[PDB]
Amino acid sequence: LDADLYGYRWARDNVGQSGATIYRLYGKPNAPELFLKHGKGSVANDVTDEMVRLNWLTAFMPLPTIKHFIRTPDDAWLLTTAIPGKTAFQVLEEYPDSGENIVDALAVFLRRLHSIPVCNCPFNSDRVFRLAQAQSRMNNGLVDASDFDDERNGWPVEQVWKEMHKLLPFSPDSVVTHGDFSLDNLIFDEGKLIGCIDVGRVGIADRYQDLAILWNCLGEFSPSLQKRLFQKYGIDNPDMNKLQFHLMLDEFF
Numbered sequence: 172l173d174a175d176l177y178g179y180r181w182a183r184d185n186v187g188q189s190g191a192t193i194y195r196l197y198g199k200p201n202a203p204e205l206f207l208k209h210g211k212g213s214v215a216n217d218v219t220d221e222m223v224r225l226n227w228l229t230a231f232m233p234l235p236t237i238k239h240f241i242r243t244p245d246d247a248w249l250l251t252t253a254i255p256g257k258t259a260f261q262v263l264e265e266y267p268d269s270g271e272n273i274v275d276a277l278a279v280f281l282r283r284l285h286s287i288p289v290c291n292c293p294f295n296s297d298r299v300f301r302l303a304q305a306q307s308r309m310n311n312g313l314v315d316a317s318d319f320d321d322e323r324n325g326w327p328v329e330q331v332w333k334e335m336h337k338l339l340p341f342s343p344d345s346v347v348t349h350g351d352f353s354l355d356n357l358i359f360d361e362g363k364l365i366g367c368i369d370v371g372r373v374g375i376a377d378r379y380q381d382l383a384i385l386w387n388c389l390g391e392f393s394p395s396l397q398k399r400l401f402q403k404y405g406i407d408n409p410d411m412n413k414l415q416f417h418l419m420l421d422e423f424f
């Protein structure tokens with residue numbers, strides 16, 4: 172029973188997400204901050220997808236703990252503990268001189284996730300799977316041509332779709348990925364990167380799935396920081412074709 176919510180103050184958080192209602196639970200005497208995600212209709216499946224991934228990935232990485240999860244035919248409710256601290260973005264903005272330490276911490280953390288042996292992963296998040304989702308979102312008109320990257324702004328959804336297809340085929344690579352390795356999804360506390368959130372897309376895919384999203388986020392701070400991500404991670408010459416493909420695929424989500 173969800174009655175383990177008494178004494179909490181409620182707030183509704185718009186973190187620019189897709190679908191799910193996120194409630195922040197705070198102000199309870201000597202009780203931790205909690206988050207409650209609610210998905211209605213098809214969004215119940217997205218909240219269900221996150222719950223399994225949190226449940227599985229917690230044996231390997233630092234993530235929010237599942238306190239309670241409820242599923243009924245149209246609704247999914249996900250109650251978790253919060254990861255204390257600030258997003259990597261908020262940290263980067265407040266302390267520009269910590270850029271290099273943050274990027275290094277992000278690359279080390281991403282290497283840890285990518286190092287989890289694939290033989291442990293029950294989720295498929297590969298290009299073929301994601302291209303199908305991208306296609307259903309384009310054909311349902313759910314893709315927002317407003318939130319596109321600068322090099323693609325003003326482009327109709329179908330231009331991105333056709334141009335992205337010219338970058339294929341590409342070399343086979345498979346590691347355990349986050350799916351949305353952005354500056355808003357990595358949590359910092361007292362200089363250290365303490366965990367990640369928004370694990371709904373976790374599964375086996377190409378490492379550029381995570382590398383491309385973070386690299387792009389770093390583009391709004393410095394090209395030297397974007398360069399250091401690949402240098403700390405350990406890639407000599409970043410695959411720009413793979414980088415562009417993953418950046419274009421993220422436009423449909």
Ligand SMILES: NC[C@H]1O[C@H](O[C@H]2[C@H](O)[C@@H](O[C@H]3O[C@H](CO)[C@@H](O)[C@H](N)[C@H]3O)[C@H](N)C[C@@H]2N)[C@H](O)[C@@H](O)[C@@H]1O
Nearest residue numbers: 187188189318319320321351353387388391421422424
């Ligand atoms: N639609 C919902 C999704 O919205 C964001 O993802 C979007 C990015 O924001 C866009 O990129 C822009 O914002 C980045 C900072 O995040 C900037 O670095 C970049 N220069 C900008 O062009 C990108 N083109 C599309 C991508 N789907 C959230 O991260 C994600 O959780 C959420 O699911």
Ligand SMILES: O=C1c2ccccc2-c2n[nH]c3cccc1c23
Nearest residue numbers: 206235251252253254255358368
């Ligand atoms: O949305 C969440 C969130 C959602 C579910 C679980 C934990 C978190 C979480 N932990 N720390 C932060 C900082 C900003 C946003 C969020 C967090």
